Amino acid sequence: MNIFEMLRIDEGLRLKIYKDTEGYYTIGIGHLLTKSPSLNAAKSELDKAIGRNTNGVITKDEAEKLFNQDVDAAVRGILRNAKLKPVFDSLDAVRRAALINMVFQMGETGVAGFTNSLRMLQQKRWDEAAVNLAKSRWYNQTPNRAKRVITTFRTGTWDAYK
Numbered sequence: 001m002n003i004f005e006m007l008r009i010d011e012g013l014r015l016k017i018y019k020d021t022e023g024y025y026t027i028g029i030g031h032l033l034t035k036s037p038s039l040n041a042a043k044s045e046l047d048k049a050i051g052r053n054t055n056g057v058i059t060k061d062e063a064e065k066l067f068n069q070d071v072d073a074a075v076r077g078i079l080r081n082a083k084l085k086p087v088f089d090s091l092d093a094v095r096r097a098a099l100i101n102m103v104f105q106m107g108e109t110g111v112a113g114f115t116n117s118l119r120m121l122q123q124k125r126w127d128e129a130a131v132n133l134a135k136s137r138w139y140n141q142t143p144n145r146a147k148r149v150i151t152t153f154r155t156g157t158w159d160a161y162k
């Protein structure tokens with residue numbers, strides 16, 4: 001298991017524009033296109049992201065290309081963020097992947113606002129951090145996925161992704 005396989009499990013793969021769990025136009029492996037309710041706006045973002053006129057459909061290779069860019073962006077966003085970087089640097093590789101997963105799903109700014117959870121993770125109070133992470137809109141709206149990510153933070157193992 002690794003961050004790419006973990007996020008493939010959590011995000012799936014769909015080659016036509018679809019709406020994500022929040023109702024937003026998305027394609028590929030959780031590649032958010034736009035929050036606009038306009039399918040035309042989403043199609044425009046997609047063509048711009050892929051570099052051709054796609055008419056809302058991409059190939060698996062193209063989906064994987066966007067996915068790698070999005071994973072890289074999540075890692076880079078963590079490392080550029082004054083609140084997320086010390087937490088990331090303090091963690092083992094498995095828990096680092098859990099943090100990348102959260103940033104991929106909710107964004108750098110969103111995760112950086114989890115001040116109390118981040119402190120508990122920095123303190124390596126794993127059960128406490130897991131309890132705090134679940135007191136969130138994130139957990140309530142996507143509980144099965146949040147449970148997997150939280151278990152990864154709690155245990156430092158890949159047990160939730162078997």
Ligand code: NA
Pocket residue numbers: 090
């Ligand atoms: Na330490």
Ligand code: NA
Pocket residue numbers: 101102103105145146149
């Ligand atoms: Na997540």
